[PDB]
C-alpha cells in the first residue's frame, strides 16, 4: 500500500563506484512512475526489452537497483550485448536484460571546485567479468613480460586507477549519475506492480 523506495535510490546522498556498486532490492510496494516518466528530469531513459508505458500494467516479482557514477562519454559500455573495458572488467549487463537505464548530469554535486578523486574503476584482470557479478580484490596484477611476483613495479600494476572530476573539464568529461532498475518475473506471486 506504500510507494516503492525509488525516490530513496534517486536521492541517495552518496553514490557507489563502478567496482563497488550497491544493489538495493525492491519488494512489498507498488511504484507509480507516471509523475517521473514525463517529468523530463532524466536525460536518458533507455528501457531495453520493455516499453516504458507497457510496464505499468504488469507485476514484477523481483527488482534489482544498481547505482554508479561514470563519465558522460562512458555510458556506451552499459548496454546489452556490448563489449568494452567497463563491461569486461567493471560492470557487465547480460543479454537478457529487461531493465530501464536512467542517467542524469551531476555537475551540481559530483563536480566542484578543487577536484574530486573519490571514484575508481578497474582495467586489469585475467578474463572478462560474468554479467551481474562484482569482485573486489586488492591483488596486484602483473604482466607476463616481467613478473615482480611480490611487489608493484615493472610490468606490475594495481587494478584500480584514480578517477577525477572538475568544473573546467569538458562536456565529455562531465560526471553522470547512472541508476539501473532491473525487473524480472517468476512463478512466485509478485509483490511489486505498476
Amino acid at each position: 500500500t506504500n510507494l516503492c523506495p525509488f525516490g530513496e535510490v534517486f536521492n541517495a546522498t552518496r553514490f557507489a563506484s563502478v567496482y563497488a556498486w550497491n544493489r538495493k532490492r525492491i519488494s512489498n510496494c507498488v511504484a507509480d512512475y507516471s509523475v517521473l516518466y514525463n517529468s523530463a528530469s532524466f536525460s536518458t531513459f533507455k528501457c531495453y526489452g520493455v516499453s516504458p508505458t507497457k510496464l505499468n500494467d504488469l507485476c514484477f516479482t523481483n527488482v534489482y537497483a544498481d547505482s554508479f557514477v561514470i563519465r558522460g562519454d562512458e555510458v556506451r559500455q552499459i548496454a546489452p550485448g556490448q563489449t568494452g573495458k567497463i563491461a569486461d572488467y567493471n560492470y557487465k549487463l547480460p543479454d537478457d536484460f529487461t531493465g530501464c537505464v536512467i542517467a542524469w548530469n551531476s555537475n551540481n554535486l559530483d563536480s566542484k571546485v578543487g577536484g574530486n578523486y573519490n571514484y575508481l574503476y578497474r582495467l586489469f584482470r585475467k578474463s572478462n567479468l560474468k554479467p551481474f557479478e562484482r569482485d573486489i580484490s586488492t591483488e596486484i596484477y602483473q604482466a607476463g613480460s616481467t613478473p615482480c611476483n611480490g611487489v608493484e613495479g615493472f610490468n606490475c600494476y594495481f587494478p584500480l586507477q584514480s578517477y577525477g572530476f572538475q568544473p573546467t573539464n569538458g562536456v565529455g568529461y562531465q560526471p553522470y549519475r547512472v541508476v539501473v532498475l532491473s525487473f524480472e518475473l517468476l512463478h512466485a506471486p509478485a509483490t511489486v506492480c505498476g
Partner: nanobody
Amino acid sequence: VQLVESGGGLVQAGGSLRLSCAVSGRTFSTYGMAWFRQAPGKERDFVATITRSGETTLYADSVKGRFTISRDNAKNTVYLQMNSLKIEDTAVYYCAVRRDSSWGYSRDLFEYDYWGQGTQVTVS
C-alpha cells in the same frame, strides 16, 4: 550513406520556413530523430525528438508552442515546422539522428550518427 537537407532562406519576424530532413537509408525503423541549433560552433542544444514507437513527443522548453515535428514513412522525410522568427533564430540547424532503437528519451550529445549542413535565417 549520408544526409540530405532541404529548405531554408531569409525571413523577417512573423514568418515561416519549414525545416525538413530525410533519411535515404533503410534503417529508419530503428533510428530516432533529434534536432540541434548552433551557428558559431556553439555547444549543440536540444530542440526536439521523437520516440521510436511514435506515441510520445518530446520538445525543448523554449521551442514549445511554436515548433512542431512529424514522422514520415513515404520518403522517411521527418518534418519540422519553424515559426515566430526571432533574432536568436539566426543559427545553423542540424539534423541529428539517433542510433539503434531504444525505448526512452535522449537529450544529450553522447551519440549521434551524422551531422547535417542545414540553413540559417537572417532577420533585419
